[PDB]
Paper text:
We performed single-particle cryo-EM analysis of a sample containing nanodisc-reconstituted yeast OST, MnCl2, chemo-enzymatically generated Dol20-PP-GlcNAc2Man9Glc3, and the non-reactive peptide TAMRA-YA(Dab)ATS-NH2, where the acceptor asparagine was replaced by 2,4-diaminobutanoic acid (Dab)31,41–43. The generation of the substrate analogs TAMRA-YA(Dab)ATS and Dol20-PP-GlcNAc2Man9Glc3 enabled us to visualize a ternary complex of eukaryotic OST, and well-defined EM density covering bound peptide, which allowed us to build the complete hexapeptide chain. Intriguingly, clear density was also observed for the attached TAMRA fluorophore in a pocket formed between the subunits [name] and [name], a location that would accommodate the nascent polypeptide chain N-terminal to the glycosylation sequon. The side chain of the Dab residue is lodged in this tunnel, with its terminal amino group positioned at a distance of 3.3 Å from the C-1 of the reducing-end GlcNAc of the glycan donor. This suggests that our structure reflects a state preceding the nucleophilic attack on the reducing end GlcNAc, akin to a pseudo-Michaelis complex. In this conformation, two residues from the EL5 contribute and complete the active site of the enzyme: Glu350 and Arg328. The second, Arg328, provides a salt bridge with the pyrophosphate group of bound LLO. This interaction is not present in the binary complex of OST with bound LLO state, where the pyrophosphate group only interacts with Trp208 and Arg404. The manganese (II) ion is coordinated by residues of the DxD/E motif47 (Asp166 and Glu168), the catalytic residues Asp47 and Glu350, and by the pyrophosphate group of the LLO. Upon binding of an acceptor peptide, the complete EL5 and TM9 become ordered, resulting in a catalytically active state.
Oligosaccharyltransferase (OST) is the central enzyme of N-linked protein glycosylation. It catalyzes the transfer of a pre-assembled glycan, GlcNAc2Man9Glc3, from a dolichyl-pyrophosphate donor to acceptor sites in secretory proteins in the lumen of the endoplasmic reticulum. In higher metazoans and fungi, OST is a multimeric complex composed of eight subunits spatially arranged in three subcomplexes that are formed during OST assembly. Subcomplex I contains [name] and [name]; subcomplex II contains [name] (or OST6), [name], and [name]; and subcomplex III contains [name], [name], and [name].
Residue numbers in the entry:
A (entry chain A): 458 to 483, 492 to 718
B (entry chain F): 170 to 282
C (entry chain P): 2 to 7
D (entry chain C): 2 to 86
E (entry chain A): 67 to 262
F (entry chain B): 1 to 33
G (entry chain E): 25 to 98, 111 to 474
H (entry chain G): 270 to 418
The structure:
Amino acid sequence: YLYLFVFHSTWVTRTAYSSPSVVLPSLIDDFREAYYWLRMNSDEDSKVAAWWDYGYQIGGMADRTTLVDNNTWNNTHIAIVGKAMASPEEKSYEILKEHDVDYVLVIFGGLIGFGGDDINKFLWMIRISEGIWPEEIKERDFYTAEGEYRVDARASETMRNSLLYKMSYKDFPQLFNGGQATDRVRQQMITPLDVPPLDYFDEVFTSENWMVRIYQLKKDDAQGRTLRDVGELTRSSTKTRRSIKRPELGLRV
Amino acid sequence: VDKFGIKPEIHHIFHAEPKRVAKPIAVIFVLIIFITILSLIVTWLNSCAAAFNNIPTGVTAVYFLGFIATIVGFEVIFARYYLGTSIFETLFSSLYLGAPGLLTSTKFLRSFG
Amino acid sequence: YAAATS
Amino acid sequence: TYEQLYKEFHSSKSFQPFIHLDTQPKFAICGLIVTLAVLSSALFAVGSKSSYIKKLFFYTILSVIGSLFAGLTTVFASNSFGVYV
Amino acid sequence: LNWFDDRTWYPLGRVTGGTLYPGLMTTSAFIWHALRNWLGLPIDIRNVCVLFAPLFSGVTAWATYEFTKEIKDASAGLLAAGFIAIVPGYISRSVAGSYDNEAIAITLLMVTFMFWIKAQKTGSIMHATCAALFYFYMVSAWGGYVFITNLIPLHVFLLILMGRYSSKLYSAYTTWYAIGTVASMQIPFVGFLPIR
Amino acid sequence: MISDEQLNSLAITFGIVMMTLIVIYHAVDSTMS
Amino acid sequence: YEPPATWENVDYKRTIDVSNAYISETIEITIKNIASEPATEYFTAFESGIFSKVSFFSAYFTNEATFLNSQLLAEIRYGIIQFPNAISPQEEVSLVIKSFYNTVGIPYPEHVGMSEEQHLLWETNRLPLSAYDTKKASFTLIGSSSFEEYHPPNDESLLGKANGNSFEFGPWEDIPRFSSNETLAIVYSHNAPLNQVVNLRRDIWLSHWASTIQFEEYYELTNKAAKLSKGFSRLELMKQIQTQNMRQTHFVTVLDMLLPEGATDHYFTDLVGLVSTSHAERDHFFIRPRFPIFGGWNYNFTVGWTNKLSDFLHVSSGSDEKFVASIPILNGPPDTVYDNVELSVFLPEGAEIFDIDSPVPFTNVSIETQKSYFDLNKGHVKLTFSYRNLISQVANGQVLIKYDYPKSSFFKKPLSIACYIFTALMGVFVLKTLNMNV
Amino acid sequence: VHSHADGTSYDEEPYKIKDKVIYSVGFSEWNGEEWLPHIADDIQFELRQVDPYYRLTLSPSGNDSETQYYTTGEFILPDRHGVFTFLTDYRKIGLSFTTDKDVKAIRHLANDEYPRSWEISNSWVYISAICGVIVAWIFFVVSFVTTSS
Amino acid sequence: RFYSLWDTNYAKIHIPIIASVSEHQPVSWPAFFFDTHFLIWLFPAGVFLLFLDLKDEHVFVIAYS
Ligand SMILES: *[C@@H]1O[C@H](CO)[C@@H](O[C@@H]2O[C@H](CO)[C@@H](O[C@@H]3O[C@H](CO[C@H]4O[C@H](CO)[C@@H](O)[C@H](O)[C@@H]4O)[C@@H](O)[C@H](O[C@H]4O[C@H](CO)[C@@H](O)[C@H](O)[C@@H]4O[C@H]4O[C@H](CO)[C@@H](O)[C@H](O)[C@@H]4O[C@H]4O[C@H](CO)[C@@H](O)[C@H](O)[C@@H]4O)[C@@H]3O)[C@H](O)[C@H]2NC(C)=O)[C@H](O)[C@H]1NC(C)=O
Ligand SMILES: CCCCC/C=C/C/C=C\CCCCCCCC(=O)O[C@H](COC(=O)CCCCCCCCCCCCCCC)COP(=O)([O-])OCC[N+](C)(C)C
Ligand SMILES: CCCCC/C=C\C/C=C\CCCCCCCC(=O)O[C@H](COC(=O)CCCCCCCCCCCCCCC)COP(=O)([O-])OCC[N+](C)(C)C
Ligand SMILES: CCCCC/C=C\C/C=C\CCCCCCCC(=O)O[C@H](COC(=O)CCCCCCCCCCCCCCC)COP(=O)([O-])OCC[N+](C)(C)C
Ligand SMILES: CCCCC/C=C\C/C=C\CCCCCCCC(=O)O[C@H](COC(=O)CCCCCCCCCCCCCCC)COP(=O)([O-])OCC[N+](C)(C)C
Ligand SMILES: *C(=O)c1ccc(-c2c3ccc(=[N+](C)C)cc-3oc3cc(N(C)C)ccc23)c(C(=O)[O-])c1
Ligand SMILES: *[C@@H]1O[C@H](CO)[C@@H](O[C@@H]2O[C@H](CO)[C@@H](O)[C@H](O)[C@H]2NC(C)=O)[C@H](O)[C@H]1NC(C)=O
Ligand SMILES: *[C@@H]1O[C@H](CO)[C@@H](O[C@@H]2O[C@H](CO)[C@@H](O)[C@H](O)[C@H]2NC(C)=O)[C@H](O)[C@H]1NC(C)=O
Ligand SMILES: *[C@@H]1O[C@H](CO)[C@@H](O)[C@H](O)[C@H]1NC(C)=O
Ligand SMILES: [Mn+2]
């Protein structure tokens, strides 16, 4: 039994407890690749807004300021980030801008099949924000009308319009040829029309296996109009305006 | 009429420094403590008998002085620490004093007992 | 097992 | 002068190693043994309880030999593990 | 010890002085300084941080050897040390690369327990002081020191109820409590928690 | 450097050597005491 | 400071080549001696900005194969050429002057898409800038597929014709000296990454005990090509790669370093860890950065390898304990421009440097000592050469060092380790025979 | 520019809670011919974390030839520590908008920057107790090894 | 967290961040084998054997266990 103990212990140590975390064995080096890009091609004072789980790693490898870390002394702050990721892009933009955030980082495992992606941690963010602000983020709206957590063509309108969803599935269907892509952690089909355009954020980096995706807040319009209007202008195909009708705008101060 | 007009001034409101007692009361209590120490030191030498009979004599006296010098000298170190010197200086001074003191104190205690 | 969300 | 130094370099013989790197690992596995033996004897020379002077004599000579062997072993082992000295 | 990092929790910041346990870092820094200044080999700080846990695994094995040697014999101590060296349960949180608090913490725990048992059965002030100093080291290293703070009293309490009170017990416990408690209120994180 | 398989062999070799030596210690200690 | 001694340029032919990540110039001048007194020197003229970054300056005789003495004299700044023999009062001499500069043109449209080819804009003087009157001239731009001019002047004479890939500017036949009132801006095509190394740090460690010379280079690299318009899209990059877009590109995906023969123990890491995409072939070390370096991106990495000391260290004949070492100056990618180089040769503790030589001029030499893994006495001798503008293939020189390493100093390393172990053992002895029992 | 009240900079001494600092900034106008000094009384300065902790009206103090300088007099930094922004946002209608920002870190108080024990009277009492105990312990040890039983 | 060790359902009710981290969850029987093979059956025995011969050291070990 003692010799069996030696053998069992060595096998257990080799198989399960000796795996590194920064590099998934295949090597998949997406984490370090994205963090190094952030370290080399971003301003030294820039701030990165991601989930708490990946705070320490960023500070160690990206060497950039972080809103939240693995140590969780303040829970309202983490709730703020969770609200910033479970709400429509306008609200997210306003909240993140109010905290001088430059970049947003998301983890996506749809291609490889990571399983530790943000979409497999979204229901927790919605919970934590729900605690602080019970009237704005409601967990019962990220489900279908039947109670199902779907990321398919049968997702809730609130799901499809959240920041995390629209920022993780961007340009995904156009990857898999034919005009329809297939996820590999949730096993559902995403079509090019299931993903609305992002009008407040730019993509600046996407790792090689599409595991880390880094977006950058775009500066507000010089003309002082909502970025959704700039978008709906740059998209809507040129056509004659409907008519000239007196605008309902109120009273000028 | 948002962010178009001069804005009201804001001024931070600070807390209060905790109240320290008036020096007369502290002086009275310091005197009480000093009197207590003196009363102890005299109770030993008077009502109680601290005989001081067996003062060491011969070569053992040298070890006795070495022992007393380690005993007072560690306290001198700790006072030199309370008054500003660094932990590293207080950690090297202790080593220097301790090694010959660890030899001479053990020797006194071995001889006398 | 690590300090991360499940 | 670049010309003079260059001519001296080219018309000269190349470096020859004292002990080739390939053979140095074996020397380490031999030197370790010798040090282990001598040092162990030295460690077993502080219990002899024969004579303080005899203990000092034995310990000192054995320690000297062991120290020289250990220094050589350290150099050979360092070189053999890829940390060149 | 007086470090405010402005690169974490950006609006608020973090005062690391009173939100961090300073003993793993201090031990690593001491090993680094010792290797480069005295022994003469200047290894990197990443390498010391990586190979910190493998180094203290042997210390934990020796501590287990002594602790078991205090309960039965030296043979049982050798068996215990052999078991703890390769046991997957300990290995899980102490593989080369793992640099959390547990790496050194579970070593100090066994050392503290060794001294406590040596102090309780013998009845000596010196071993109780050694236990108190290592308990301080654990307080400064990990946040699960509270286990010791509630296990050493419990043992003593049971010994009172089974009728096995002696003077060795008074001496050992009072000396451990006094020195350990006054010394564990010096870590800024702990503060005045021991009394309130 | 040393390969993974060789590391596995070294780990198991050290473990077996350790266990046998401990068993020998126990046997001698029990018989002689 | 117009040069007093005078010459006359009978023919001044200038050819500027733009096919690399730098500018190479070749001026073929025939000079006559205006002055009756025999003249021995010639002064060439550079502007201020161009003289600030000129990497290689050379001059030679058209007929002969020898290199005339040529220096840079330190606001038309000058360089001085020195003729081997005194030139007669009236006589003609033909020289070919060759210069390599550290400047390339800026992209004319600063932002281009991943696929589009890049066009670069270069600004220079069209008319010969000289300190001596010129009776004929030409200027020919070679090395790019397309040459066009930005803001061409009205005059027909100041215009360029295209023969093959060249852009000839036509033979002028009367040029005043010191006349630089004309500016030429030319846009040329380019489809290559403009690799700039901001700083390079080279460490070369010599070890006598193990006959191995180890090289470790830290690169700070940046691509100077056109920035990516509309941002970086992984989708576009993958679509390019899958369709076998094997044409030319202006972003860096793989770097092919050329190492000395027989190299072993290759490694390629960066500040975050060991990169795995690094194929070592025969004397070539292919390296793939983590992320493709597009226009304006920074990548800092470290490469390293090991060689044999017998290939670089030679022993002097008169004394067995004096050594001469010749060390290469650059072992980098094929086409690259360096802006600062700090070459540090580490020598064993005993060595005492005796003579030093560098083929290219340096900006600073310093000798100090830096400790190492078993340095228990003082440390390795560190000799550092600082250089400024160096080009990948022009700068092929070898630093020569002569040092004295006595046999007494070879054996001292074991002895020092032995003295440490001996003192530790004596300390154990004292600690073991000193009773402290009360 | 912002500095300590005594002229010390931020690099020589990083800011600490409840410190006294001065903020100054200058302005200039373009009549279309020459830059001149801009005399305005509406300019304000804000020290913000995410919401204004200090809003102070800047006062004219010191004119150059082409510029006029404004200053907030010495003010004490908050007792709250963190990363605070020093902001001057001039946004008047008809005029050009000018924004100046500067994120600085306001540290907490270190361990050695608290008042020492000999300066608090309550501490006087407790120090007296500690000294009396150390002195009595020394006397005790000398007497325990001297006096025969 | 110490209260949570007695009121097992407490975490989810109030603190929602403690119940998201995988580290603070119960363990199924297989894990007490995967980690201490052979020792796990032999430990409950050693506790009984130390209980038949109570000493102060043994009282310690028993409480710990
Ligand atoms: C964890 O993270 C979270 C989020 O990241 C951190 O939480 C944030 O903490 C902030 C400060 O601690 C807090 O901001 C305060 O909120 C107060 C309440 O806001 C709500 O109510 C008000 C109406 O009362 C609404 O307007 C508002 O929209 C909210 O609904 C505000 O009252 C605070 O305002 C005061 O402070 C700010 C900042 O200094 C001033 O700009 C403002 O003018 C107010 O100033 C008064 O008080 C200060 C002292 O605080 C005085 O210096 C000043 O002169 C003013 O004093 C007058 O008024 C007071 C009474 O207020 C009176 O006594 C005095 O005599 C004067 O008359 C401020 O806005 C954030 O809201 C909060 N965020 C969230 C999401 O919770 C949390 O700190 C982190 N945890 C940590 C760090 O441990
Ligand atoms: C205060 C006294 C402390 C007590 C110690 C006793 C005194 C004697 C001193 C040391 C003797 C041996 C020390 C050598 C260990 C360094 C190896 C290293 O660090 O190797 C690391 C990685 O290892 C390896 O490759 C193999 C790992 C094997 C290590 C062996 C472990 C035995 C010792 C364990 C604990 C050692 C304690 C030291 C650190 C806490 C270097 O990897 P790298 O990426 O940096 O370079 C790699 C080389 N490129 C540049 C080409 C990339
Ligand atoms: C026979 C006689 C022997 C005497 C007894 C010896 C040992 C008793 C042990 C208990 C010590 C209690 C507290 C000590 C405070 C030391 C820190 C310090 O010193 O930091 C202090 C304050 O920081 C702290 O609170 C820090 C909290 C403590 C952190 C300790 C580090 C943790 C590591 C533990 C083990 C380290 C081992 C390393 C390698 C093995 C500043 O010091 P300073 O340089 O400003 O000093 C100037 C002198 N002022 C005091 C007048 C200004
Ligand atoms: C007291 C009893 C000690 C017993 C030790 C027993 C066994 C040790 C077994 C294995 C440890 C070495 C295995 C890993 C080898 C590669 C490490 C590596 O590659 O890392 C090294 C640094 O690491 C080390 O210094 C390893 C130290 C090796 C020590 C070897 C053991 C013999 C000496 C024992 C202690 C004697 C102390 C005497 C003091 C007077 C990476 O250096 P670098 O990145 O600068 O690359 C070099 C690039 N230049 C050179 C261009 C800068
Ligand atoms: C209480 C004491 C502690 C007991 C033991 C503790 C820890 C040891 C357990 C496990 C260590 C795992 C080994 C991993 C090392 C990876 C590197 C490697 O395996 O290097 C192997 C080399 O190996 C060997 O030839 C072994 C050398 C034989 C050494 C003789 C015994 C060692 C003596 C050490 C202490 C001597 C000091 C004496 C006085 C203080 C391959 O390296 P490479 O091909 O890259 O060489 C680079 C290429 N050239 C060859 C050109 C350089
Ligand atoms: C903590 O939550 C946790 C620790 C370990 C494991 C685990 C593995 C994780 C990563 C692995 N690699 C990427 C190599 C392999 C793992 O192997 C395991 C095997 C078992 N067995 C045999 C029952 C159990 C756990 C691991 C996990 C995990 O992913 O399950 C989680
Ligand atoms: C990687 O190398 C680049 C190139 O030298 C470094 O860039 C310089 O960084 C300093 C400080 O950030 C700036 O002042 C210089 O202007 C930068 N130079 C260029 C050309 O951009 C960069 O700092 C290095 N990065 C790391 C992490 O070491
Ligand atoms: C050349 O030598 C060195 C190159 O590093 C420089 O002088 C030293 O620079 C270091 C850099 O920190 C300083 O610490 C030293 O004080 C300088 N002097 C010495 C003697 O080391 C400098 O660039 C040049 N020195 C010259 C030309 O004298
Ligand atoms: C500054 O002083 C006043 C304005 O306050 C006025 O005389 C003029 O604008 C300036 N004079 C000088 C000498 O700068
Ligand atoms: Mn932890």
